[PDB]
Design a protein around this motif. Structure first.
Motif, PDB file in Angstrom:
ATOM      1  N   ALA A   1       1.055  -1.275  -0.019  1.00 20.92           N
ATOM      2  CA  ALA A   1      -0.005   0.230   0.298  1.00 20.92           C
ATOM      3  C   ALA A   1       1.042   0.942   0.228  1.00 20.92           C
ATOM      4  O   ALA A   1       1.774   1.000   0.580  1.00 20.92           O
ATOM      5  N   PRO A   2       0.389   2.623  -0.638  1.00 22.37           N
ATOM      6  CA  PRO A   2       0.690   3.336  -0.426  1.00 22.37           C
ATOM      7  C   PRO A   2      -0.256   4.004   0.845  1.00 22.37           C
ATOM      8  O   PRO A   2      -0.963   3.239   1.010  1.00 22.37           O
ATOM      9  N   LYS A   3      -0.237   5.591   1.232  1.00 21.21           N
ATOM     10  CA  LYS A   3      -1.138   5.642   2.033  1.00 21.21           C
ATOM     11  C   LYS A   3      -0.756   7.657   1.386  1.00 21.21           C
ATOM     12  O   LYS A   3       0.461   7.916   2.023  1.00 21.21           O
TER      13      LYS A   3
ATOM     14  N   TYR B   1       5.055   9.526  -3.310  1.00 18.07           N
ATOM     15  CA  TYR B   1       4.651  10.172  -4.715  1.00 18.07           C
ATOM     16  C   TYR B   1       4.063  11.315  -4.492  1.00 18.07           C
ATOM     17  O   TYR B   1       2.985  12.102  -3.299  1.00 18.07           O
TER      18      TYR B   1
ATOM     19  N   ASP C   1     -12.959  16.065 -12.260  1.00 15.13           N
ATOM     20  CA  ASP C   1     -12.503  16.024 -11.774  1.00 15.13           C
ATOM     21  C   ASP C   1     -11.397  14.868 -11.581  1.00 15.13           C
ATOM     22  O   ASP C   1     -11.756  13.261 -11.021  1.00 15.13           O
ATOM     23  N   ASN C   2     -10.167  15.030 -12.129  1.00 12.95           N
ATOM     24  CA  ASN C   2      -9.536  14.717 -12.238  1.00 12.95           C
ATOM     25  C   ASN C   2      -7.773  14.795 -11.230  1.00 12.95           C
ATOM     26  O   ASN C   2      -7.504  16.544 -11.243  1.00 12.95           O
ATOM     27  N   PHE C   3      -7.510  13.522 -10.888  1.00 19.51           N
ATOM     28  CA  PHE C   3      -6.104  14.286  -9.810  1.00 19.51           C
ATOM     29  C   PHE C   3      -5.251  12.897 -10.740  1.00 19.51           C
ATOM     30  O   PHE C   3      -4.790  12.187 -11.019  1.00 19.51           O
TER      31      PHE C   3
ATOM     32  N   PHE D   1      -0.857  12.458 -10.567  1.00 22.64           N
ATOM     33  CA  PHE D   1       0.620  12.347  -9.491  1.00 22.64           C
ATOM     34  C   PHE D   1       1.894  12.210 -10.555  1.00 22.64           C
ATOM     35  O   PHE D   1       2.391  13.151 -11.770  1.00 22.64           O
ATOM     36  N   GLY D   2       2.641  12.517  -9.444  1.00 23.83           N
ATOM     37  CA  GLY D   2       4.087  12.656  -9.689  1.00 23.83           C
ATOM     38  C   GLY D   2       5.351  11.236 -10.172  1.00 23.83           C
ATOM     39  O   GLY D   2       4.934  10.279 -10.518  1.00 23.83           O
ATOM     40  N   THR D   3       6.837  11.723 -10.996  1.00 23.05           N
ATOM     41  CA  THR D   3       7.352  10.848 -11.092  1.00 23.05           C
ATOM     42  C   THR D   3       7.928   9.902  -9.503  1.00 23.05           C
ATOM     43  O   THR D   3       8.139   8.617  -9.450  1.00 23.05           O
TER      44      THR D   3
ATOM     45  N   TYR E   1      -7.106   2.186  -8.476  1.00 26.49           N
ATOM     46  CA  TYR E   1      -6.097   3.299  -8.785  1.00 26.49           C
ATOM     47  C   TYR E   1      -4.663   2.046  -9.271  1.00 26.49           C
ATOM     48  O   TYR E   1      -4.461   0.913  -8.593  1.00 26.49           O
TER      49      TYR E   1
ATOM     50  N   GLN F   1      -0.842   0.780 -10.649  1.00 25.49           N
ATOM     51  CA  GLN F   1       0.440   1.003 -10.636  1.00 25.49           C
ATOM     52  C   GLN F   1       0.971   0.234 -11.648  1.00 25.49           C
ATOM     53  O   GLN F   1       0.745  -1.348 -11.416  1.00 25.49           O
TER      54      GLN F   1
ATOM     55  N   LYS G   1       6.208   2.653 -12.775  1.00 19.11           N
ATOM     56  CA  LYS G   1       5.716   4.202 -12.556  1.00 19.11           C
ATOM     57  C   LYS G   1       4.790   4.170 -11.458  1.00 19.11           C
ATOM     58  O   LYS G   1       5.200   4.426 -10.209  1.00 19.11           O
ATOM     59  N   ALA G   2       3.417   5.292 -11.685  1.00 19.86           N
ATOM     60  CA  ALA G   2       3.126   6.037 -10.325  1.00 19.86           C
ATOM     61  C   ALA G   2       1.541   5.791 -10.575  1.00 19.86           C
ATOM     62  O   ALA G   2       0.857   5.406 -11.741  1.00 19.86           O
ATOM     63  N   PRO G   3       0.753   5.845  -9.458  1.00 14.94           N
ATOM     64  CA  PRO G   3      -1.031   5.897  -9.695  1.00 14.94           C
ATOM     65  C   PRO G   3      -1.699   5.939 -10.764  1.00 14.94           C
ATOM     66  O   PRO G   3      -2.797   6.779  -9.631  1.00 14.94           O
TER      67      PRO G   3
ATOM     68  N   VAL H   1      -4.772   7.078 -10.913  1.00 13.12           N
ATOM     69  CA  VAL H   1      -6.036   6.285 -10.760  1.00 13.12           C
ATOM     70  C   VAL H   1      -7.670   6.490 -11.770  1.00 13.12           C
ATOM     71  O   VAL H   1      -7.438   7.281 -12.430  1.00 13.12           O
TER      72      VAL H   1
ATOM     73  N   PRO I   1     -12.194   7.888 -15.409  1.00  8.10           N
ATOM     74  CA  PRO I   1     -11.072   9.665 -14.953  1.00  8.10           C
ATOM     75  C   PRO I   1     -10.980   9.970 -16.812  1.00  8.10           C
ATOM     76  O   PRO I   1     -11.207   8.573 -17.629  1.00  8.10           O
TER      77      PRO I   1
ATOM     78  N   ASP J   1      -0.233  -3.419 -10.512  1.00  7.47           N
ATOM     79  CA  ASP J   1      -1.230  -3.649  -9.934  1.00  7.47           C
ATOM     80  C   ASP J   1      -2.438  -2.904  -9.486  1.00  7.47           C
ATOM     81  O   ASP J   1      -2.533  -1.728 -10.265  1.00  7.47           O
TER      82      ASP J   1
ATOM     83  N   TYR K   1      -5.208  -1.169  -6.816  1.00  7.83           N
ATOM     84  CA  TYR K   1      -5.436  -0.662  -5.383  1.00  7.83           C
ATOM     85  C   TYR K   1      -6.570   0.109  -5.341  1.00  7.83           C
ATOM     86  O   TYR K   1      -6.922   0.781  -5.957  1.00  7.83           O
TER      87      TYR K   1
ATOM     88  N   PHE L   1      -6.335   2.751   1.196  1.00 14.59           N
ATOM     89  CA  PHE L   1      -6.197   1.849   0.278  1.00 14.59           C
ATOM     90  C   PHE L   1      -6.152   0.763   1.005  1.00 14.59           C
ATOM     91  O   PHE L   1      -5.879  -0.333   1.538  1.00 14.59           O
TER      92      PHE L   1
END
Lengths: 216, 216
Positions: free
Chosen positions: A45-47, A89, A97-99, A101-103, B38, B40, B44-46, B48, B57, B87, B89, B101
């Motif tokens: 998990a991330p959190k 991240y 409605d869009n989120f 993310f980072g590298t 989401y 992954q 890469k990164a998550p 959504v 989205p 993956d 989540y 998550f």
């Protein structure tokens, strides 16, 4: 399109601290305040640790901190303890409605004591035998760093066959753990005087031996 | 918290409809109609790919269906493409300070025949007890796809503490292998009637039961 720009390397030493960048545009990080900071352990998990630019989640420890400065959000993790090794991240609300993310940043601590492993050899259990198969688990635990080799032994002479050896996970104490197994017929088992598990770490060799004696 | 149970591994061939669940413990049932799927990929990164239960989205291909039938969010990739390997989540915002998550689901595109784990449990070595140590090691081998749950029991009681599962590794037979250890005190070892190791994997679940017995 685009991501968000973090740099992949935030190294620090314990006690000290680190300061991660997450640069967006006046379309995500710039305009909306909703910048969040994920903490993530290897393919786990991330959190959320930071969520509205900066604020404490409760059960998130007292010293991961968020900053905003224009197109740029920043996490500064102050005081550095071992476990802070992760991948962090960011997320920035876009619009409709869009989120995004980072590298992400891989965070590394330095000055973490190195450990030579605890090596526990496990002889083939009673039932294993009742079923008529034998397996030997060498549990190579609690080491640091995560380079360690494994060897098995026939009887002095080597065992370069039968062995599957998982390569090293990370545990609740930011110390690594691995295992190795010799799968053999109980024939093989009761034939030999002993089977060894040799484990090699930062020059410190360990050898554990097992003889048909057991209690199992 | 770890309050959204997701399967360990889901898998299909190119063309199969892979359904994935986020089963939430008690809490805000019909209470966060606000679950988010989401991805992954490795490295890469998550991304959504689902927000607010069923909502896609921007630019998520329609294949990636979504619903929450009852207490259970179920993502559904309704036509498996290679790149779907990732993956997954789920997530739930349970009140400002609380983002959760799921445990995570790995999607594999079937590259080998499916192969359920051989759960093999080892009991504290005679000698090891001579040294006043108690360690069990659940070994899990020869599985595909390589993404497996582990749970321990002290008399049908989740042993929540001292557990150290590792991470799947490729064995030379191109199948995976993991192991969970459990560090204990001798007295606690005797003071329990049995100890089991239950390993969940893609419908099949294996539980191996162990007990104290002696020599000395």
């Amino acid at each position: 399109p685009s991501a968000l720009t973090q740099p992949p390397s935030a190294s620090g030493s314990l006690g000290q601290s680190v300061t991660i960048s997450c640069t967006g545009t006046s379309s995500d990080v710039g305009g909306y305040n909703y910048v969040s900071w994920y903490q993530q352990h290897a393919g786990k998990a991330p959190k959320v640790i930071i969520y509205e630019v900066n604020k404490r989640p409760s059960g998130v420890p007292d010293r991961f901190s968020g900053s905003k400065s224009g197109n740029t959000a920043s996490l500064t993790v102050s005081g550095l303890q071992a476990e802070d090794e992760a991948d962090y991240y960011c997320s920035s609300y876009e619009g409709s409605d869009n989120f995004v993310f980072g590298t992400g940043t891989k965070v590394t601590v330095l000055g973490q004591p190195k450990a030579n492993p605890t090596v526990t050899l496990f002889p083939p259990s009673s039932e294993e035998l009742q079923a008529n198969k034998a397996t030997l688990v060498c549990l190579i635990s609690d080491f640091y760093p995560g380079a360690v080799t494994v060897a098995w032994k026939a009887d002095g002479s080597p065992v370069k066959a039968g062995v599957e050896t998982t390569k090293p996970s990370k545990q609740s104490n930011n110390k690594y753990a691995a295992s190795s197994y010799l799968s053999l017929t109980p024939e093989q088992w009761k034939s030999h005087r002993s089977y060894s598990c040799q484990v090699t770490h930062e020059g410190s060799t360990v050898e554990k031996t097992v003889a048909p004696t057991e209690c199992s």
